């Protein structure tokens, strides 16, 4: 059986395990050496109830743009981290006793529970694909639908309170995202992005020596322009502070930052003077920084990200939804808080973003092979091995989820992913009949990301316009056109 088949190679596996541990140690040393000087400090923050940490990718998932590492090497890093996770049953005899060998036997029974060393294959890509096709796709295919249902019922709420909890403008997008297994039509990622309307406006407060300022597209454009100009720091900081005071005046004319009038957040006013400390009409006591002149406004280097996720936040998800998201992403989930599973999910998210960056450095998706792209999509959890799609469809799927994960929101990511895991079984043998049309094929051009899409009104859905029909499409798609024709 597989027990004796794996026991036969158990002696030959320890050397490979230790070699992999050495590679992991070297790689983590290198990566942390880079991270400890280029990456900022994402402080730990606690949930609304202030008992457990909460995690978000915008702050904690950092991408080393400029990482001198091969994509296959990063795949090795992540896969060996998962192998370290899978090596945990070796501690059972060292905590239970000599009778703690039966857990090790159960571990050695199934090959999917095991690390890389017990596999006959050599290449990391073929090895990962074997593991997925043997164990991982099956485990994910039995969690996908029930996670989709939990996400639905998290939006719409329980016990017939949809008229109190759902929104009437995201309705058609909700239907297209969650009930496309009924129609068989493809989905547009922008309709999944429309789910963020349940949340508020995500803001970024830059902390200065006087007051916090809300970041805008204009200020960000100016800062990117100044950073691209490659000026001396005496001019760089001056231009940055000029843009900063300009934006400060702009928001002061707007009526202050958006955070002042949001439930759960707020900026305090000047402190009050109590009793005899009140000096006539001056009932307030301004801060020390009020003495500083406004022309000396300088950025402290500190930032505060506020997703304002009132319905989407991972804190309010629950004990079950987090565990099922980690099952669906093949992460550890048992016997841990939702904060620890949140961190595991954010680490996976960061890995996927770093992998996207390295692919873009290595020349995009088309430079990859077919098996490598299949394994990438399996890691992204948008493909099941019982599909056998084309290369253009795989590339379009990757582009879709890459743009969707660029927004840094796990809820919409899971809503997108779970749609590709709704498979049925027929009770009859003759039905379903053999189709007559060819397989579904697409291209990178069919994905509309460079254009905005308004939310369709309820019970008034609009047809899908191809990007090619837009004006100047041959100009906008020229990069993708050159990449595909080449």
């Amino acid at each position: 059986t597989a027990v004796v088949k794996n026991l036969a190679k158990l002696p030959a596996a320890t050397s490979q395990i230790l070699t992999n541990v050495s590679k992991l140690q070297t790689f983590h040393g290198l990566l942390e050496e880079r991270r400890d000087k280029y990456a900022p400090l994402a402080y730990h923050t606690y949930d609304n109830l202030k008992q457990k940490t909460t995690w978000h990718p915008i702050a904690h998932a950092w991408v080393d743009e400029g990482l001198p590492v091969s994509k296959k090497e990063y795949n090795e890093y992540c896969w060996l981290k998962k192998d370290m996770q899978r090596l945990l049953p070796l501690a059972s005899p060292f905590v239970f006793g000599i009778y703690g060998i039966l857990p090790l036997a159960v571990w050695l029974s199934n090959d999917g529970y095991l690390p890389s060393a017990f596999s006959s294959k050599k290449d990391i890509v073929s090895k990962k694909l074997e593991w997925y096709s043997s164990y991982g796709d099956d485990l994910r295919q039995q969690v996908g639908p029930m996670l989709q249902h939990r996400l639905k019922r998290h939006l719409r709420g329980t016990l017939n309170n949809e008229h109190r909890l759902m929104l009437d403008e995201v309705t058609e997008s909700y239907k297209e995202i969650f009930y496309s297994h009924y129609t068989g039509q493809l989905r547009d990622v922008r309709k999944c992005a429309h789910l963020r309307l349940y949340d508020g406006t995500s803001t970024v407060l830059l902390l200065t020596n006087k007051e916090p300022v809300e970041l805008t597209s204009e200020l960000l454009q100016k800062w990117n322009a100044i950073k691209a100009a490659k000026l001396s720091p005496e001019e760089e900081k001056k231009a940055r502070n000029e843009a900063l005071i300009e934006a400060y005046k702009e928001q002061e004319l707007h009526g202050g930052p958006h955070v002042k009038h949001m439930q759960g957040y707020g900026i305090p006013a000047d402190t009050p003077l109590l009793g005899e400390n009140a000096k006539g009409d001056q009932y307030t006591q301004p801060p020390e920084s009020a003495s500083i002149p406004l022309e000396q406004l300088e950025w402290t280097g500190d930032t505060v990200f506020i997703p304002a996720e009132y319905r989407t936040e991972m804190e309010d998800w629950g004990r079950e939804l987090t565990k099922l998201a980690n099952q669906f992403l093949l992460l550890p989930w048992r016997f841990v808080s939702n904060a620890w599973n949140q961190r595991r999910l954010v680490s996976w998210f960061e890995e996927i973003l770093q992998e996207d960056a390295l692919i873009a450095k290595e020349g995009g998706v088309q430079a990859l092979s077919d098996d490598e792209l299949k394994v990438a999509l399996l890691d992204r959890a948008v493909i099941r091995c019982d599909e056998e799609l084309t290369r253009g469809d795989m590339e379009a799927r990757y582009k879709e989820i890459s743009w969707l994960m660029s927004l840094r929101n796990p809820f919409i990511v899971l809503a997108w992913q779970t749609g590709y895991y709704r498979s049925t079984y027929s009770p009859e043998d003759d039905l379903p009949e053999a189709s007559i049309l060819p397989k579904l094929n697409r291209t990178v051009l069919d994905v509309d990301v460079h254009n905005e899409l308004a939310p369709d009104h309820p019970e008034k859905p609009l047809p899908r316009v191809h990007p090619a029909l837009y004006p100047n499409s041959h100009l906008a798609l020229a990069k993708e056109v050159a990449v595909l024709a080449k």
Binding site: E459, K460, P461, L462, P463, V465, L469, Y470, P471
Partner: protein
Amino acid sequence: EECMFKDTRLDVLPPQVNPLNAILAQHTAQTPVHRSLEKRLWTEVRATAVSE
């Protein structure tokens, strides 16, 4: 309350509106007139290019 025992799919059908008309309308609203005449020139020169 008796919504399940009816068929109002004909009472509520998807509209036949083409969003491309609103897109070209926003394109013309953003573009000036001399660029429209330039585009007529681009088309004419493309016709002569296909001819030659």
